[PDB]
Amino acid sequence: TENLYFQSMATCTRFTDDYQLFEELGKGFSVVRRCVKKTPTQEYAAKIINTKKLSARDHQKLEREARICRLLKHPNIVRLHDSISEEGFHYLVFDLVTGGELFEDIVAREYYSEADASHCIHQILESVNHIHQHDIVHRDLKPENLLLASKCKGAAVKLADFGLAIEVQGEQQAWFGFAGTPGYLSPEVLRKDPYGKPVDIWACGVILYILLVGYPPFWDEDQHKLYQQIKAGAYDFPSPEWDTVTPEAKNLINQMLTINPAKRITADQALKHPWVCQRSTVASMMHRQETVECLRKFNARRKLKG
Numbered sequence: 641t642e643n644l645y646f647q648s649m650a651t652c653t654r655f656t657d658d659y660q661l662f663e664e665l666g667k668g669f670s671v672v673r674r675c676v677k678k679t680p681t682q683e684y685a686a687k688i689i690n691t692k693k694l695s696a697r698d699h700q701k702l703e704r705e706a707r708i709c710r711l712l713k714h715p716n717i718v719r720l721h722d723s724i725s726e727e728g729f730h731y732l733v734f735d736l737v738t739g740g741e742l743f744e745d746i747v748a749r750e751y752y753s754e755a756d757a758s759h760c761i762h763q764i765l766e767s768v769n770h771i772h773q774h775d776i777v778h779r780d781l782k783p784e785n786l787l788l789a790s791k792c793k794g795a796a797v798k799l800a801d802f803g804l805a806i807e808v809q810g811e812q813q814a815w816f817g818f819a820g821t822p823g824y825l826s827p828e829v830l831r832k833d834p835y836g837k838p839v840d841i842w843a844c845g846v847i848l849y850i851l852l853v854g855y856p857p858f859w860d861e862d863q864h865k866l867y868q869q870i871k872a873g874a875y876d877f878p879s880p881e882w883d884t885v886t887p888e889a890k891n892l893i894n895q896m897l898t899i900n901p902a903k904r905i906t907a908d909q910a911l912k913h914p915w916v917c918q919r920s921t922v923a924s925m926m927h928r929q930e931t932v933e934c935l936r937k938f939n940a941r942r943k944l945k946g
């Protein structure tokens with residue numbers, strides 16, 4: 641009744657027996673490597689976690705990530721296919737996503753308008769809305785974690801990396817700690833105030849701003865000054881690039897980039913916003929070449945730093 645009760649969570653050799661390990665894709669605690677299941681042949685991405693070292697707190701964080709990934713089955717979230725416990729290592733086996741970052745694919749297009757921005761943000765908000773409904777907060781929405789499923793026509797945007805995700809109690813806010821990425825951090829996390837689901841919508845507003853113009857609404861080289869701007873919601877819509885952006889897109893950005901999280905738009909309401917919801921009649925169809933060029937520089941900057 642050990643293996644009968646624990647089942648797929650019981651210690652085993654399921655990974656070593658049923659999969660072959662191939663190259664490293666990334667690294668950070670853990671490594672993500674491509675792998676191929678033998679029995680019915682298919683490609684996956686195994687996150688590999690060395691468990692010999694781990695503290696009680698790190699086990700809880702690993703179990704949390706595993707649980708959260710198991711729970712989330714949505715076309716715009718990268719699916720966990722298995723969670724395998726072996727003697728010294730744990731393996732989270734995910735779908736392999738081969739289309740690369742969303743932001744990289746955008747700069748490679750012939751045409752790119754608001755209507756394409758809205759289409760991306762529609763998919764991104766569907767994933768955020770899904771996780772919020774399941775009382776999960778991602779806490780680290782950013783370009784690096786918005787991937788395309790495949791290089792194929794019509795590939796979905798997929799949310800990745802729930803390494804920082806938290807489970808919340810319905811709509812209750814608490815101090816869950818200082819986590820996230822500088823440029824996308826919410827005022828409430830910087831204030832050290834209680835928080836929850838709204839923090840992910842703040843991040844979506846920053847992403848949405850970048851999808852429209854190709855540069856971030858908040859930046860300073862001095863991180864103390866960056867954080868002051870974010871707390872003050874010190875962004876704007878400079879001309880000339882913002883002059884051709886529809887007032888509807890601007891409206892959605894303002895609602896997402898609202899300092900007080902209680903007043904900030906929800907994912908569910910953002911999905912009912914006309915620019916998202918009635919994209920076809922509301923979103924502009926004019927190509928935004930200046931956005932593609934800024935995005936190129938935005939991607940290069942990030943690549944040059946990493």
Ligand SMILES: Cn1cc(C2=C(c3cn(CCCSC(=N)N)c4ccccc34)C(=O)NC2=O)c2ccccc21
Binds near residue numbers: 666687737785
């Ligand atoms: C090309 N590719 C696909 C994936 C990937 C992938 C993940 C992509 N990320 C985000 C990591 C964002 S690179 C960063 N700067 N941080 C993950 C974090 C934790 C577990 C898995 C993944 C996933 O779920 N399926 C996949 O195919 C991946 C993961 C790490 C590095 C490259 C990579």
